[PDB]
Amino acid sequence: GPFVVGGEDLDPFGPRRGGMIVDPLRSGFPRALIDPSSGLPNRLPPGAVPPGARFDPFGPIGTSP
Amino acid sequence: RFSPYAFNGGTVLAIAGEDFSIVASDTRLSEGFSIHTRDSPKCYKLTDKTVIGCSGFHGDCLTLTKIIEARLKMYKHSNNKAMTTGAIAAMLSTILYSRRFFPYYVYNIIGGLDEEGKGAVYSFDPVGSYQRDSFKAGGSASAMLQPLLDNQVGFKNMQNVEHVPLSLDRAMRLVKDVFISAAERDVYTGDALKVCIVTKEGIRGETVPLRKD
Amino acid sequence: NQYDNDVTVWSPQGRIHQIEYAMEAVKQGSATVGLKSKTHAVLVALKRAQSELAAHQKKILHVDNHIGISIAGLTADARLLCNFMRQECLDSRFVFDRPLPVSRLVSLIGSKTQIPTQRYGRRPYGVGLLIAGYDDMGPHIFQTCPSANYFDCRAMSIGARSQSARTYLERHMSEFMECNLNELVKHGLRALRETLPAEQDLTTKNVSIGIVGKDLEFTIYDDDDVSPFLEGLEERPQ
Amino acid sequence: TTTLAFKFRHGVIVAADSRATAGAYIASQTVKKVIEINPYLLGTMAGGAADCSFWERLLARQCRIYELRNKERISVAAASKLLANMVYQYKGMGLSMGTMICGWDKRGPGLYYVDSEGNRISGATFSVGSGSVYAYGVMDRGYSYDLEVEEAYDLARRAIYQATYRDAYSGGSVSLYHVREDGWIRVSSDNVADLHDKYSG
Amino acid sequence: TTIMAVQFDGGVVLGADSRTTTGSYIANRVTDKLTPIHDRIFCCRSGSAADTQAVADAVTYQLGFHSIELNEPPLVHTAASLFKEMCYRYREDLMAGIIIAGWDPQEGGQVYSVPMGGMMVRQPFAIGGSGSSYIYGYVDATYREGMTKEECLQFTANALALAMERDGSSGGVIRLAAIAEPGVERQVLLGDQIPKFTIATL
Amino acid sequence: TQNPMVTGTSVLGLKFEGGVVIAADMLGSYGSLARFRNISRIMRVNNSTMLGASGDYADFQYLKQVLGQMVIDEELLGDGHSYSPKAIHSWLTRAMYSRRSKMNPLWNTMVIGGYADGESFLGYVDMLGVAYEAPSLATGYGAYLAQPLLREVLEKQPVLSQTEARELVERCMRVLYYRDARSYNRFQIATVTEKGVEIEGPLSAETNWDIAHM
Amino acid sequence: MAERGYSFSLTTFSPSGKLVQIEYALAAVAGGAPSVGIKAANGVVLATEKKQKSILYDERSVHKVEPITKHIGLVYSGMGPDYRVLVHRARKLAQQYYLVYQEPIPTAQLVQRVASV
Amino acid sequence: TTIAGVVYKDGIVLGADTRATEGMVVADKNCSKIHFISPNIYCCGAGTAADTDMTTQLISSNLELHSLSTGRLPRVVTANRMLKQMLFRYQGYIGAALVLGGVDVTGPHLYSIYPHGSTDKLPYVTMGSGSLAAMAVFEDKFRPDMEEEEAKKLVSEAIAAGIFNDLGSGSNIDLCVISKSKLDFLRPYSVPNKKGTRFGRYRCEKGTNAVLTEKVTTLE
Amino acid sequence: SEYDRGVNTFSPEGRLFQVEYAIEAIKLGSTAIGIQTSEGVCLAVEKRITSPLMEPSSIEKIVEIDAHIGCAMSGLIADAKTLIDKARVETQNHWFTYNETMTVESVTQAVSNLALQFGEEDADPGAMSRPFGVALLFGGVDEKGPQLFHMDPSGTFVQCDARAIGSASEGAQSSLQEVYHKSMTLKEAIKSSLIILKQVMEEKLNATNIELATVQPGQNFHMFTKEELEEVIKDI
Amino acid sequence: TGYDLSASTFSPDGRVFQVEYAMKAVENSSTAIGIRCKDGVVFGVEKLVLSKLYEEGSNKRLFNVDRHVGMAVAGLLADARSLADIAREEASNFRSNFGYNIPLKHLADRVAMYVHAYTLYSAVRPFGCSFMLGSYSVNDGAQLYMIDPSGVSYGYWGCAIGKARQAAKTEIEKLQMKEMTCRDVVKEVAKIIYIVHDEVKDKAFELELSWVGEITNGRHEIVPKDVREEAEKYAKESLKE
């Protein structure tokens, strides 16, 4: 997944994506993937947290309902 | 499903001098929002002149370091001599590309001395694309530390500044300061800084504490 | 006769002649001596030169940081065995992160060398090894044979005219144990010199020394590193 | 990435930028995107740096073996065909390479474009990379087979400079190579800031 | 499906319902889910019918060959181990929860549970199938140490009747098997022989 | 293993002066159901090594069988060499990484405790091949609930006695029973010292429920 | 133990151009029990002698005349176990032919396949 | 498709409808769904028709080889074991479901075999899209140890219920009666459905069709 | 008479019969001489032309393994072709993997590891049925300076200051023992090699009867041209 | 002539001479004996010291096939080591498959079948060793089996293999082993080994003793040094008169 390389370095438009150098951290690697609903008795609705907004997890990873 | 990868943090920095090479890393191993351990250095001594730093998926780092050790022993047996820093870099590039379709999630920086005695630094992408550099930061705080090394070591975006050759003491101070800043701003960097200094007199290790929060 | 051409053919006397011929192949090689003290294991090999303008053939090889061997017999067979042992040691260090015990390596060598002696179209390994190692059990001297049999030895010599060396080792085995490194190497050198004719003397050209110990990795002294060990050796008693 | 190569009366001019990007982050500004395969053969990097470097190193090994076996240097067409056949076996597996094989052989100057999709076309002028459209425009406006050597150098430098100006994944310095009958030469390596001073000023 | 094996001093008591369903349609209402693996070893099958049948056939084959070779009666632990090995080697391809119960000259009555995944554990009693969830509290509150064979049969019949009443995938008749040193005794409970519990009304 | 079926909860490890202590509850859960309440998740490897595992119990049984066979073979050789806790840890790391690289992982997180040559060993291996040593360990939910307390005590007092280590382990077990829904109040405590490996159980923790009246 | 067989032919040409192993197999056949086959206008009769060396044998246990299909029969002269092997192979070949073409194999086709074996 | 079978006091009665459909269109009005396995064993098929045909043919060939080797009458248990092992090792990719019935030295046996490899030994079984109507008929009227005529009537009633209550079944009723002394392959056994008689005539005469080119080849 | 024994049977003296027979086969080849000096390595081989209609330029008894390694062969040249190809492939593989040049010793070891890989049973199709019938003289310049190596089908390889292989290897080696010394220059080595070749060759030495190549520090493998050979043979 | 070159060839008399030659090779080795008593099995090997340079315990002819199974060998030592590896693999596989320790009879049968597999083809050579298997368990008691190069396996009360096995058998027959214990059987085995050894023919030997039984809690192990010294002293004093 995040190991994509050379797609965007060869053609500005096209299905292929990726730069010249492989870097999962720069290609949407989950890093610490936490559910927004972690630490909650109920699951959050889809789109509750807008991307780019300051979010504080309600609990650690693994406490998702 | 099943994910064969995980991000365990860790920043690796290397600076090549005129007669020295420095490889530095933090000693914090993590996963998600937790800390696995506070003493897990990312620097490994390969030969008397070469030190490698590996960050990323920790299982891949362990396997890759063990494979590199085995290959160095094989080379010493087959050729009756130890590998050079450039030979190690080329071999590591081949090893990383051998897993092109299931890559090692490792950020590799090789720091040491070349055949002329000058400091050599090699930076690797996970599939083996590498080049020789004078300084390089890799890992979770690479984007934080690289511009500062460009400004301070490369004297970039500066005018009326003499390009004085980098000395060992100044490089050590700079490495300590940049890792202090990284520990300030990066959540994966902290709990210690381990510095390996590669000179013609051997390899010297040093430890500097960082903040634990 | 008709029983001496195949390794799968027993003789009416209960013997296999191809194995004995491979033992003769081992006996054809130049003499080497292995001996150990309480803390060190030493291999001294008498190298041979094809001509006056040819370098003396390598006889001591690196296997691991704690294991080295000296060969006598077919050199290609020796290289095959050395590669197998190196791979086994590397696998041990990769899987368990510890040096492979010497006895287990020797058992693996014997198991590998037994297989060709029982299958049609194969031949015994025509090389004999002296193995010097150090591990948690201390120093070890081992001898392997083309018959796939191996021996744990206090001291041993294989190759041409090794009987005199074995006699000297028999004489001085009582004091081999408490010797220091220099004394042990001198004992090994005297045993090796016992294999040489009177007109021939030990020199820096035809002597190779391999040493492993508690605080010392396996090291080979070949040409100029041999002179300190050669210095102090008395003249041949005749 | 912007790499260009064109043939003219005095050989093949090869130019490239030196910026490598990881997402929106500039990983390196000093990448050697022109690969010196041999003293007579050149290659270019576009797409995956590791892919291009590895497969052109394999091509260099193959060319050296060919020279040893046949006691004669491989041709540009044969080298490009070898690279194309090598990369066609992994088609659809994710390799991203766009390269130009440039050299001089018994047929004169040679210039082939080879990509991981399987294309292999000989041509006069080529441009590969994300900034290849701008370089194409500038080069086509300024190209002629009868160009002088200094004029060809200026054209290649200007085209790469404009491509780096308009493309976000192109930058660093312009590396210029000239392929002649007796091998190639590394002409220069000029930083984009110096070129901006020379051109705008 | 509800299956149940209980151990008493002289041996074991096995029980199962007889309903096989394809969705909500009962394809076989008189199914026999108690499979004899050897003379004194039975197995209770739950999950995929094809997987359990194939595994039981293979274990019967292997155990018969092993017993013929050794000229000795097989151990219940050996049958459980064969089931466990087969169910663990193919845990991704099989859907089989097995209960192995039998009698041994060396060990007496034994109940082994091999659930999906391929783990093996010895228990005083075991329950499996989709209907076993409804009777966990009942067997927890009702089981006691030292029950005789008749008490074990009554306990198994009661638990199976409750599970069949509550579970839609369970029903039909109750098949019981008692295994001891003298041999194996089998019986079928149907109609009014099945224990009755009155429905609470008003 | 793609989908673990019967799983074990957190396993704790703690080094003290003279050996290591390892604790794990005796429950195997089938999802949310507490199905097997008398299983042992701690194994004795040899006279100097013990092992406790979380995750799929069938995979743990397979690994127990393989490790026991390895120990049997090595003792059959009888040449004076025995596997150290570090060697067992390295072999486990290699096996887990090999399984992960084939997309057929052993769904387990194991704690290796040992005492050889007068020094304690505590090792962690997960299903992905991530391994490290630490003075204290806690897998699963214990990494969030039990590890902070052990780390706090070790930060105040780096070296603990056996009694203090056992008391801290009991407190961590009580906290895990309070706050972990997949845990049980019936656990084992295994200790390795110069005298060997000793496994104690079943044990229960004393619980307070006076906040129910608040 | 080694499961490999000999990869060289045991039947080879002689200086006179004869395969003597085939001639010796023919001698083995000629030393066998008599067998007779007669094609009549409306059928074929296969006859052979089966005289056991003792009365302790069970005459009803081993049959020298064997059916291959519902319309093909076999009888031999020579070595019995070889005949058993060829009978098994002929039955398998006929069943394969029926599986492919869904009609019973003609006698000529089965004869050709057995001769090929 | 409606296939059914019962065990009566002296043997096996198998029944099937003779309609084959491709989607919602009837392709064959007289389809034989009862397959020969051995002179004493027959099989009714459902599912992928080609899979059923090939599986029944292969098992019949193997049983013929087995009976030729042993010299004895084939057993229904042997056919059941072969079928279930072959189906299981393909993990249901061979979508053949079968009603297997026959009489041997042990008596009459009836099996239902499913594509994944699971079998059931029952006194009466139904299969196909009309299986539930036939099963209702069986559960309403079946009694153990029926006579041959009563069993034939019951199987015909079950197949008729499947035919008249399922859109995938129709046409005629085929019966296979197996006992230790005889085998009765009744095709057809009943004809409950027929084409309606013509009320008029269609226009179809010589010369109605225009022809561009014509080529005639004389066969000697 | 030649099939009484397998390819891997020991003699009562401890020698494989086939290896000894290959050693015997070597002695039928043309003489080749290698001399190693501090200034480089020189290789000289007798071409041994059979007919004047033959083109001597097609005989290649000296080959370039790499830019810094050369090989002289004696015996069955068709057998040496595959060994030379293996050596070239090994050098290129080492360059690919490590971005450096092989040492002469490692190349000789890699070639010698193929010598005993023969046998009938337990062999893949296309495996060697017999040992090679060639002796190889490997001369090159690496970080340890110029070096000369000798290889034989027994699998043994040694470093040599000056060695001769082929039919006249006995007389040439005795001549090599006298003329050679450590302080020898490259020109002296070439002159002595040509003198010994002229002594041992049946035909008169000329620019077409012989091959001569040199490897020196800072210079690639260089095969002498006809004018250079004419210059060297001018005064001997 | 030529009927004795392959194990896949019968002699006109109906003999396989290669197996007989392997047995002859076995008959040239030193003597190892094993005695079964009412509570265990004791093994004793007359290990010849060919050279004084060899370490003590070198070329040991007693093996631990399993935790409960011991092996005493005679003949070619490399073949014996390969057969010990085969027996170890068989025991490990049995425990892996069926989940419990292999019975000694079953292990003996498996290893004997493996040995017999080498007496049928020209591609392989019959094993040049014969060995004994001893074990003890609560359920099965003491068991002792011997396997010869032909692949024949029998259970024994007292067995001897090697150069002097008829004299060793005569010495063993004087023992009422069915009522003795391992403690006395160790001394008796030592005495028999010292009796059958040839001082004139053989320069020196080591006495290798091992046992499995209730005194060892069902484990096969080397007889402890104290008991070994007592047994050696008793054997020497019994040789003297």
Curated annotation (Swiss-Prot), chain A:
Localization: Cytoplasm; Endoplasmic reticulum
Modified positions (Omega-N-methylarginine) in chain numbering: R17, R43
Residues annotated as region Disordered? 33-65
Q: Which residues carry this modification: Asymmetric dimethylarginine?
A: R31
Say which domain of life the source belongs to. Answer: Eukaryota
Phosphoserine: modified positions: S64
> What do we know about how this protein assembles, alone or with others?
Monomer and homodimer. Interacts with FBXO7.
State the similarity comment. Answer: Belongs to the proteasome inhibitor PI31 family.
Role noted for this protein: Plays an important role in control of proteasome function. Inhibits the hydrolysis of protein and peptide substrates by the 20S proteasome. Also inhibits the activation of the proteasome by the proteasome regulatory proteins PA700 and PA28.
Q: What is this protein called?
A: Proteasome inhibitor PI31 subunit
State the species of origin.
Bos taurus
What is the name of the gene encoding this protein?
PSMF1
UniProtKB/Swiss-Prot annotation, chain F:
Q: What is its main location?
A: cytoplasm
Keyword hit for Acetylation: yes
Top-level division of the source organism's lineage? Eukaryota
Q: Which residues carry this modification: Phosphotyrosine?
A: Y57
Q: Which GO terms describe its biological process?
A: proteasome-mediated ubiquitin-dependent protein catabolic process
Subcellular location per the Swiss-Prot or TrEMBL entry: Cytoplasm; Nucleus
Q: What are its GO cellular component terms?
A: ciliary basal body; cytosol; mitochondrion; nucleoplasm; nucleus; proteasome core complex; proteasome core complex, beta-subunit complex
The record's comment on protein family reads: Belongs to the peptidase T1B family.
Known role: Non-catalytic component of the 20S core proteasome complex involved in the proteolytic degradation of most intracellular proteins. This complex plays numerous essential roles within the cell by associating with different regulatory particles. Associated with two 19S regulatory particles, forms the 26S proteasome and thus participates in the ATP-dependent degradation of ubiquitinated proteins.
Q: How does it assemble?
A: The 26S proteasome consists of a 20S proteasome core and two 19S regulatory subunits. The 20S proteasome core is a barrel-shaped complex made of 28 subunits that are arranged in four stacked rings. The two outer rings are each formed by seven alpha subunits, and the two inner rings are formed by seven beta subunits. The proteolytic activity is exerted by three beta-subunits PSMB5, PSMB6 and PSMB7. Forms a ternary complex with SMAD1 and OAZ1 before PSMB4 is incorporated into the 20S proteasome. Interacts with PRPF19.
* The protein's name: Proteasome subunit beta type-4
Q: Which organism is it from?
A: Bos taurus
What is this protein's gene name?
PSMB4
UniProtKB/Swiss-Prot annotation, chain I:
Q: Which GO terms describe its cellular component?
A: cytosol; nucleus; proteasome core complex; proteasome core complex, alpha-subunit complex
Write out the annotated subcellular location. Cytoplasm; Nucleus
Question: Which cysteines does the record link by disulfide bonds?
Answer: none
- Any Pfam family: Proteasome
Query: SUPFAM superfamilies this protein is in?
Result: N-terminal nucleophile aminohydrolases (Ntn hydrolases) (SSF56235)
Q: Does the keyword Ribosomal protein apply?
A: no
* Residues bearing carbohydrate: S193
Q: Which UniProt keywords apply?
A: Acetylation, Cytoplasm, Glycoprotein, Nucleus, Phosphoprotein, Proteasome
Q: Which residues carry this modification: Phosphothreonine?
A: T50
User: Where is the PTM Phosphoserine found along the chain?
Assistant: S11, S51, S58
UniProt key word Membrane: no
Q: Which GO BP terms apply?
A: proteasome-mediated ubiquitin-dependent protein catabolic process
The entry describes its oligomerization and partners as:
The 26S proteasome consists of a 20S proteasome core and two 19S regulatory subunits. The 20S proteasome core is a barrel-shaped complex made of 28 subunits that are arranged in four stacked rings. The two outer rings are each formed by seven alpha subunits, and the two inner rings are formed by seven beta subunits. The proteolytic activity is exerted by three beta-subunits PSMB5, PSMB6 and PSMB7. PSMA5 interacts directly with the PSMG1-PSMG2 heterodimer which promotes 20S proteasome assembly.
Q: Which family does it belong to?
A: Belongs to the peptidase T1A family.
> What is the recorded name of this protein?
Proteasome subunit alpha type-5
Chain's gene name: PSMA5
Swiss-Prot record, chain J:
Q: Does the keyword Iron apply?
A: no
The role this protein plays is:
Component of the 20S core proteasome complex involved in the proteolytic degradation of most intracellular proteins. This complex plays numerous essential roles within the cell by associating with different regulatory particles. Associated with two 19S regulatory particles, forms the 26S proteasome and thus participates in the ATP-dependent degradation of ubiquitinated proteins.
Question: Source species, please?
Answer: Bos taurus
Q: How does it assemble?
A: The 26S proteasome consists of a 20S proteasome core and two 19S regulatory subunits. The 20S proteasome core is a barrel-shaped complex made of 28 subunits that are arranged in four stacked rings. The two outer rings are each formed by seven alpha subunits, and the two inner rings are formed by seven beta subunits. The proteolytic activity is exerted by three beta-subunits PSMB5, PSMB6 and PSMB7. Interacts with AURKB. Interacts with CDKN1A. Interacts with MDM2 and RB1. Interacts with the C-terminus of TBXA2R isoform 2. Interacts with DNAJB2.
One cellular component (GO) term of this entry: proteasome core complex
User: What superkingdom does the record give?
Assistant: Eukaryota
Belongs to which family? Belongs to the peptidase T1A family.
Q: Tell me where in or outside the cell this protein is found.
A: Cytoplasm; Nucleus
From the Swiss-Prot or TrEMBL record, give the protein name.
Proteasome subunit alpha type-3
Record-linked PANTHER family? PROTEASOME SUBUNIT ALPHA/BETA
**Keywords for this protein:** Acetylation, Cytoplasm, Nucleus, Phosphoprotein, Proteasome
In Pfam terms, one family for this protein is Proteasome
Name the gene that codes for it: PSMA3
